[PDB]
Design an enzyme around this catalytic site. Sequence first.
Site, PDB file in Angstrom:
ATOM      1  N   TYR A  45       0.798  -1.101   0.245  1.00 20.33           N
ATOM      2  CA  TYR A  45      -0.051  -0.064  -0.054  1.00 20.33           C
ATOM      3  C   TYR A  45       0.663   1.280   0.111  1.00 20.33           C
ATOM      4  O   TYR A  45       2.117   1.167   0.388  1.00 20.33           O
ATOM      5  CB  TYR A  45      -0.785   0.122   1.303  1.00 20.33           C
ATOM      6  N   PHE A  55       2.238   9.598   3.370  1.00 16.50           N
ATOM      7  CA  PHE A  55       2.484   9.464   4.938  1.00 16.50           C
ATOM      8  C   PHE A  55       3.007   8.155   5.033  1.00 16.50           C
ATOM      9  O   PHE A  55       3.564   7.876   6.265  1.00 16.50           O
ATOM     10  CB  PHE A  55       1.568   9.829   5.792  1.00 16.50           C
ATOM     11  N   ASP A  56       2.785   7.082   4.077  1.00 16.69           N
ATOM     12  CA  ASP A  56       3.498   5.759   4.568  1.00 16.69           C
ATOM     13  C   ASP A  56       3.374   4.854   3.165  1.00 16.69           C
ATOM     14  O   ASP A  56       2.500   5.188   2.319  1.00 16.69           O
ATOM     15  CB  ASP A  56       2.690   5.088   5.824  1.00 16.69           C
ATOM     16  N   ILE A  75      -7.506  -0.211  11.004  1.00 23.21           N
ATOM     17  CA  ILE A  75      -8.607   0.631  10.939  1.00 23.21           C
ATOM     18  C   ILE A  75      -9.786  -0.071  10.395  1.00 23.21           C
ATOM     19  O   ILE A  75      -9.735  -0.941   9.705  1.00 23.21           O
ATOM     20  CB  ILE A  75      -8.196   2.060  10.319  1.00 23.21           C
ATOM     21  N   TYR A 101      -8.969   7.066  12.131  1.00 22.57           N
ATOM     22  CA  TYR A 101      -8.284   7.484  13.443  1.00 22.57           C
ATOM     23  C   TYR A 101      -9.198   8.566  13.919  1.00 22.57           C
ATOM     24  O   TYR A 101      -8.821   8.893  15.136  1.00 22.57           O
ATOM     25  CB  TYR A 101      -6.883   8.139  13.068  1.00 22.57           C
ATOM     26  N   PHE A 118      -5.792   5.477   0.034  1.00 20.40           N
ATOM     27  CA  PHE A 118      -4.932   4.511  -0.183  1.00 20.40           C
ATOM     28  C   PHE A 118      -4.741   4.015  -1.411  1.00 20.40           C
ATOM     29  O   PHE A 118      -5.917   3.719  -1.954  1.00 20.40           O
ATOM     30  CB  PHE A 118      -4.939   3.365   0.886  1.00 20.40           C
TER      31      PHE A 118
HETATM   32  C1  LIG Z   1       1.776  -0.235   9.521  1.00 23.12           C
HETATM   33  C2  LIG Z   1       1.008   0.405   9.720  1.00 23.12           C
HETATM   34  C3  LIG Z   1      -0.423   0.226   9.639  1.00 23.12           C
HETATM   35  C4  LIG Z   1      -0.801   1.027   8.635  1.00 23.12           C
HETATM   36  C5  LIG Z   1      -1.489   0.170   7.380  1.00 23.12           C
HETATM   37  C6  LIG Z   1      -2.625  -0.568   7.663  1.00 23.12           C
HETATM   38  C7  LIG Z   1      -3.795   0.768   8.012  1.00 23.12           C
HETATM   39  C8  LIG Z   1      -3.308   1.547   9.089  1.00 23.12           C
HETATM   40  C9  LIG Z   1      -3.441   0.563  10.447  1.00 23.12           C
HETATM   41  O1  LIG Z   1      -4.621   0.300  10.858  1.00 23.12           O
HETATM   42  N1  LIG Z   1      -2.491   0.505  11.284  1.00 23.12           N
HETATM   43  C10 LIG Z   1      -3.015  -0.408  12.442  1.00 23.12           C
HETATM   44  C11 LIG Z   1      -3.300   0.434  13.392  1.00 23.12           C
HETATM   45  O2  LIG Z   1      -3.479   1.668  13.515  1.00 23.12           O
HETATM   46  O3  LIG Z   1      -3.459  -0.275  14.367  1.00 23.12           O
HETATM   47  C12 LIG Z   1      -1.232  -0.842  12.886  1.00 23.12           C
HETATM   48  C13 LIG Z   1      -0.489   0.435  12.312  1.00 23.12           C
HETATM   49  C14 LIG Z   1      -1.098   0.822  10.856  1.00 23.12           C
HETATM   50  N2  LIG Z   1      -2.062   2.017   8.829  1.00 23.12           N
HETATM   51  S1  LIG Z   1      -1.778   3.566   8.366  1.00 23.12           S
HETATM   52  O4  LIG Z   1      -1.194   3.299   6.881  1.00 23.12           O
HETATM   53  O5  LIG Z   1      -3.122   4.205   8.089  1.00 23.12           O
HETATM   54  C15 LIG Z   1      -0.862   4.319   9.145  1.00 23.12           C
HETATM   55  C16 LIG Z   1       0.678   4.627   8.775  1.00 23.12           C
HETATM   56  C17 LIG Z   1       1.529   5.324   9.685  1.00 23.12           C
HETATM   57 CL1  LIG Z   1       2.967   5.585   9.015  1.00 23.12          CL
HETATM   58  C18 LIG Z   1       1.136   5.731  11.115  1.00 23.12           C
HETATM   59  C19 LIG Z   1      -0.313   5.176  11.471  1.00 23.12           C
HETATM   60 CL2  LIG Z   1      -0.650   6.015  12.877  1.00 23.12          CL
HETATM   61  C20 LIG Z   1      -0.993   4.527  10.500  1.00 23.12           C
END
Ligand SMILES: C=C[C@@H]1[C@H]2CCC[C@@H](C(=O)N3[C@H](C(=O)O)CC[C@@H]13)N2S(=O)(=O)c1cc(Cl)cc(Cl)c1
Length: 127
Positions: A45, A55-56, A75, A101, A118
């Site tokens: 992704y 951002f990621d 999420i 979030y 995404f």
């Molecule tokens: C490895 C990271 C993942 C990514 C990819 C999946 C979607 C989402 C997410 O559900 N996350 C989980 C959470 O929050 O419990 C674990 C951390 C985060 N994010 S994300 O891309 O939205 C995300 C990226 C970053 Cl750099 C920081 C954050 Cl807080 C979320």
Amino acid sequence: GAPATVTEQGEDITSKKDRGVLKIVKRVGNGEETPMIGDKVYVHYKGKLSNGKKFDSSHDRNEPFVFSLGKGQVIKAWDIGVATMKKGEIAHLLIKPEYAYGSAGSLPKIPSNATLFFEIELLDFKG
Ligand SMILES: C=C[C@@H]1[C@H]2CCC[C@@H](C(=O)N3[C@H](C(=O)O)CC[C@@H]13)N2S(=O)(=O)c1cc(Cl)cc(Cl)c1
């Protein structure tokens, strides 16, 4: 750009039909089967904020993100969205904060009340 396009042209994939998660299929995947609850899913992704910035990216880490589908390990929009995908599919998701979030955000990177974009590729899924 792509975020605007999924905003304006995407399909509502929420059960509530509240337009909280919109989707466009960019590349059609294989056959008809989508993963089931509890499957281990392997995804690449890239995520962008509404300021236009990436951002990621798992691509930039050279390895996919792996999680168990439907367990709240991600999420809400990801659980909903990846559940609609076929193996090999690439999709765009446009996610309102209620399915991400929320008002809390997630410091440092995700502000309060953030709509997220995404591009997501479902590499594989396995029980
Ligand atoms: C490895 C990271 C993942 C990514 C990819 C999946 C979607 C989402 C997410 O559900 N996350 C989980 C959470 O929050 O419990 C674990 C951390 C985060 N994010 S994300 O891309 O939205 C995300 C990226 C970053 Cl750099 C920081 C954050 Cl807080 C979320």
